[PDB]
Amino acid sequence: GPSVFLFPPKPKDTLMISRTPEVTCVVVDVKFNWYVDGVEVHNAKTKPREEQYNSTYRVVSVLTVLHQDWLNGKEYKCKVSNKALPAPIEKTISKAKGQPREPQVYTLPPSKNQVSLSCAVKGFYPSDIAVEWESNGQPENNYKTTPPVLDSDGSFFLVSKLTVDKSRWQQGNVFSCSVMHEALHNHYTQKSLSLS
Amino acid sequence: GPSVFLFPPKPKDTLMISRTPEVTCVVVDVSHEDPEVKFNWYVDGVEVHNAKTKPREEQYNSTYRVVSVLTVLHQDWLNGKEYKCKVSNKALPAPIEKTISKAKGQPREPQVYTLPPCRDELTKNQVSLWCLVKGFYPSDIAVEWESNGQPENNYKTTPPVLDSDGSFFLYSKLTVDKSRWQQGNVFSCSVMHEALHNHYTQKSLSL
Ligand SMILES: *[C@@H]1O[C@H](CO[C@@H]2O[C@@H](C)[C@@H](O)[C@@H](O)[C@@H]2O)[C@@H](O[C@@H]2O[C@H](CO)[C@@H](O[C@@H]3O[C@H](CO[C@H]4O[C@H](CO)[C@@H](O)[C@H](O)[C@@H]4O[C@@H]4O[C@H](CO)[C@@H](O[C@@H]5O[C@H](CO)[C@H](O)[C@H](O)[C@H]5O)[C@H](O)[C@H]4NC(C)=O)[C@@H](O)[C@H](O[C@H]4O[C@H](CO)[C@@H](O)[C@H](O)[C@@H]4O)[C@@H]3O)[C@H](O)[C@H]2NC(C)=O)[C@H](O)[C@H]1NC(C)=O
Ligand SMILES: *[C@@H]1O[C@H](CO[C@@H]2O[C@@H](C)[C@@H](O)[C@@H](O)[C@@H]2O)[C@@H](O[C@@H]2O[C@H](CO)[C@@H](O[C@@H]3O[C@H](CO[C@H]4O[C@H](CO)[C@@H](O)[C@H](O)[C@@H]4O[C@@H]4O[C@H](CO)[C@@H](O[C@@H]5O[C@H](CO)[C@H](O)[C@H](O)[C@H]5O)[C@H](O)[C@H]4NC(C)=O)[C@@H](O)[C@H](O[C@H]4O[C@H](CO)[C@@H](O)[C@H](O)[C@@H]4O)[C@@H]3O)[C@H](O)[C@H]2NC(C)=O)[C@H](O)[C@H]1NC(C)=O
Numbered sequence: 001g002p003s004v005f006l007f008p009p010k011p012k013d014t015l016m017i018s019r020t021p022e023v024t025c026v027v028v029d030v031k032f033n034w035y036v037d038g039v040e041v042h043n044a045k046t047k048p049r050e051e052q053y054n055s056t057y058r059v060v061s062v063l064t065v066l067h068q069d070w071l072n073g074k075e076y077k078c079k080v081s082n083k084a085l086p087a088p089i090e091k092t093i094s095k096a097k098g099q100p101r102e103p104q105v106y107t108l109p110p111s112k113n114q115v116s117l118s119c120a121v122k123g124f125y126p127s128d129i130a131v132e133w134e135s136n137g138q139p140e141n142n143y144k145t146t147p148p149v150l151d152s153d154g155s156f157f158l159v160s161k162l163t164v165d166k167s168r169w170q171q172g173n174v175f176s177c178s179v180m181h182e183a184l185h186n187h188y189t190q191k192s193l194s195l196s
Numbered sequence: 197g198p199s200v201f202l203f204p205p206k207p208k209d210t211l212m213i214s215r216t217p218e219v220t221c222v223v224v225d226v227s228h229e230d231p232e233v234k235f236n237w238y239v240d241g242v243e244v245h246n247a248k249t250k251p252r253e254e255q256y257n258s259t260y261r262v263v264s265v266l267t268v269l270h271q272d273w274l275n276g277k278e279y280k281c282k283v284s285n286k287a288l289p290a291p292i293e294k295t296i297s298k299a300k301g302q303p304r305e306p307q308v309y310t311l312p313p314c315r316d317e318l319t320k321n322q323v324s325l326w327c328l329v330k331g332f333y334p335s336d337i338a339v340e341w342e343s344n345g346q347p348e349n350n351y352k353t354t355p356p357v358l359d360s361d362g363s364f365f366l367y368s369k370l371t372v373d374k375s376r377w378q379q380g381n382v383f384s385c386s387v388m389h390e391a392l393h394n395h396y397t398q399k400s401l402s403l
Contacts, residue, residue, distance in 0.1 A: 106317065108326060111309040118311065120326060122369070146354040146367065159354065159367040161330070 003029045004080045006091035011128040014070045015180045015187040023076045023093065025061045028052075031081035032061040033088075037074050070095055071182055096126035100183035101155055103129060107177055107193040115169050117193055119177035122157035124148075130180040131160045135173050140164070169195055197287045198225045198233075202279070202294040207336040210273045211388050211395040217273055219266050219296060221281035226252065226260040230287040235264040238280040239272065273298060274390055299334040303391040304363050306332035310385055310401035313377065323377045325401055327385030330365035332356070338388040341370045343381055348372070378403065 005028070009021030025032065025044075034041045044063040051057055065076065075094040082088075103124035110116055121131060127148035133140040142163045148156040160177060169175075175193040201224070205217030223233055237247045247266040254260055266279065278297040311326035329339060335356035341348040350371045356364035368385060382402045388395055 104317075106314045108311045108314065111311070116309075116328070116330065118326070118328065118367070120324070120367070120369075122324065142360065144357055144359055144365070146357050149352055149354050151352055151369075152350070152371075157352070157369060159326075159328075161328075161365060 001029065001085045002027055002080070002082055002089070004078065004089040004091050006076075006078050006093045008093055008095070008128075009065060009070060010130075012130040012180055014067050014128070015130070015182060017067055021065050021067060021070055023063045023065055023078070025063070025078035025080065025091065027059045027061075027080055027082075028056055030057045030059060030084060031088075033079040033081070034061075034063050035077040035079070036065070036069060073097060095128070098125060100181075101125040102183040103179055103181050103189070105177065105179050105189055105191045107175075107191045109193065109195065110169070113166050114163055115166050117162040117164065117169075117175050119160040119162070119179075119191065119193075120157070121160070121179055122151065123155045124157075124181055124183060125155050126182070127156045128182070129156070129158070131158070132178040132180075133160065133162045134176045134178060135164075135168075140175075198223050198227075198283065198285050198292070200281065200283050200292040200294050202281050202296050204296055204298075204336075205268060205273060206338075208338045208388055210268075210270050210336075211338070211390060213270055217268050217270060219268055219279045219281075221247075221264045221266070221283065221294070222261065223263075223283050223285070224255070224259065224261045226262060226285060227287055228258070228260075230285055231260055232286065233260075233262045234284040236282040236284075236291075237264070237266050238282070239268075240277050241280070276300065298336070301333055301362070304331055304333040305391040306330070306337065306387055306389050306397065308385060308387050308397055308399045310383075310399050312401060312403075318374060321374045322371055323374050325370045325372065325377075325383050325385075327368040327370070327387075327399065327401075328365070329368070329387055330359065331361075331363045332365075332389055332391065333363050334390075335364045336390070337364075337366070339366070339368045340386045341368070342384045342386065343376075348383070 005026040007024045013019040013021035047060040049057045080089045103121045108118040133143045145160040146158045201222045203220040209215045209217035249264040252260040252262045280295045284291040309328045313323035353368040354366045380403045386398045
């Protein structure tokens with residue numbers, strides 16, 4: 001039997017009008033219809049088959065979606081037709097339902113040749129969020145962010161850890177944690193870090 | 197046909213000689229027509245004979261589920277031995293095997309740091325105390341909080357996250373009333389992991 005998975009756009013893509021958010025309908029184990037709420041839609045695009053180490057083909061259909069539709073909770077339905085199973089499989093997907101809540105951002109200074117800078121982001125809803133670090137308006141590359149964790153009041157939290165040379169912290173370059181979320185003004189805040 | 201799921205001990209069970217660690221082999225979707233289930237267990241490929249298999253139990257979907265439990269020695273688990281469960285049922289073309297063991301790689305000692313609440317979280321009447329734990333391997337770990345020898349239940353802990361040098365980190369958030377914080381009470385983050393001495397460290401924080 002063929003098997004259908006359906007994936008949401010990336011958080012960052014929906015929050016910035018410049019980027020193009022996509023809903024992806026993956027099919028493992030070998031047609032495509034798309035609806036947004038009721039309405040049938042056409043702009044979807046299939047991909048070159050990606051054969052597998054287990055005699056599987058992986059066929060992927062990508063539909064581009066409007067930022068505002070996704071944010072407003074519209075529902076995306078991927079009806080996969082084929083021969084190797086009778087009834088056309090449906091999957092469906094939409095943004096998590098509920099009042100979006102604004103992340104609260106707080107940077108925390110270190111307690112070797114390297115120090116760990118922390119950015120704790122709490123109290124936000126839905127869990128869709130993107131975190132990034134920069135210095136002198138330049139992107140950092142030595143950072144990792146935990147997945148969102150469900151807090152006891154139903155909001156989410158996470159922490160981002162940025163690792164830099166003890167020396168850069170030393171002079172007092174300023175380090176900046178960017179956070180993007182639907183509940184923030186312009187979908188974007190920043191908190192700032194350096195030593196005192 | 198049937199399905200097999202094999203589950204490891206909890207981290208805390210292998211790290212404390214007082215607790216008893218177990219590996220658990222669960223078979224579901226056993227049919228009525230072919231209800232007998234046989235388990236064979238192997239440690240590092242050598243058959244063992246002390247597992248305890250429970251009587252089959254009918255589910256509401258009218259399939260059976262059968263469970264076999266094998267107690268493991270703390271040190272076998274920490275020495276990376278491999279536990280295999282082989283399940284035989286007359287509906288299967290061949291027996292199902294699953295194997296499990298501690299994640300492979302050289303253990304690394306966790307570094308535990310506490311981080312106090314920020315100033316600006318001192319307008320609400322709750323504060324957030326932070327216990328960063330990084331540089332550990334493998335990812336099996338247990339993190340808890342206490343004050344005055346009593347556990348603090350109001351905390352949440354991230355899953356271990358794969359760091360870029362191959363170790364793991366996580367943070368734990370403890371939420372307390374701002375008062376308790378300001379009276380200058382002492383909060384304790386406690387961490388259990390194989391690469392710690394006595395498998396257990398403890399870091400404190402207050403004003
Ligand atoms: C034969 O093998 C194939 C292929 O498998 C791989 O390739 C071969 C060569 C071997 O090496 C395999 O071992 C490899 O795995 C098998 O295909 C697999 O089948 C699985 C079962 O049918 C299927 O299970 C489901 O997994 C879901 C998660 O899928 C995610 O995440 C994993 C990463 O861990 C990844 O493998 C998948 O591709 C998929 O990854 C996401 O892809 C989407 C789509 O593009 C990304 O989203 C988009 O990203 C773009 C940017 O690129 C853009 O941002 C778009 O906006 C955005 O939409 C997304 O970001 C990717 N994630 C990342 C970062 O990795 C699980 O959710 C799910 O579990 C759920 O349901 C289960 C029931 O099955 C429950 O158990 C569970 O609780 C959950 O509810 C599914 O189980 C595998 O994903 C699939 N692997 C792939 C590669 O597709 C095939 O099965 C096998 N045949 C058999 C049956 O023998
Ligand atoms: C017919 O019904 C059966 C039985 O189900 C119940 O009855 C039915 C009628 C319904 O009413 C249900 O509500 C009931 O649950 C169905 O059987 C299910 O099959 C599923 C696959 O079809 C299988 O899914 C897999 O589950 C794994 C998670 O299992 C955990 O977690 C869930 C809760 O999330 C839990 O329900 C399971 O019981 C199991 O719980 C763990 O139990 C272990 C073993 O005892 C515990 O381990 C021990 O713990 C003790 C202390 O207790 C000690 O510390 C020991 O040392 C230690 O070993 C552990 O603590 C428990 N954890 C939790 C969370 O409680 C998933 O891992 C797994 O995912 C993996 O496999 C996937 C492929 O399937 C991949 O996608 C994935 O990437 C992973 O690799 C599967 O999702 C269900 O577990 C199973 N339910 C039960 C009860 O076994 C049956 O499916 C249905 N049949 C039909 C035809 O409908």
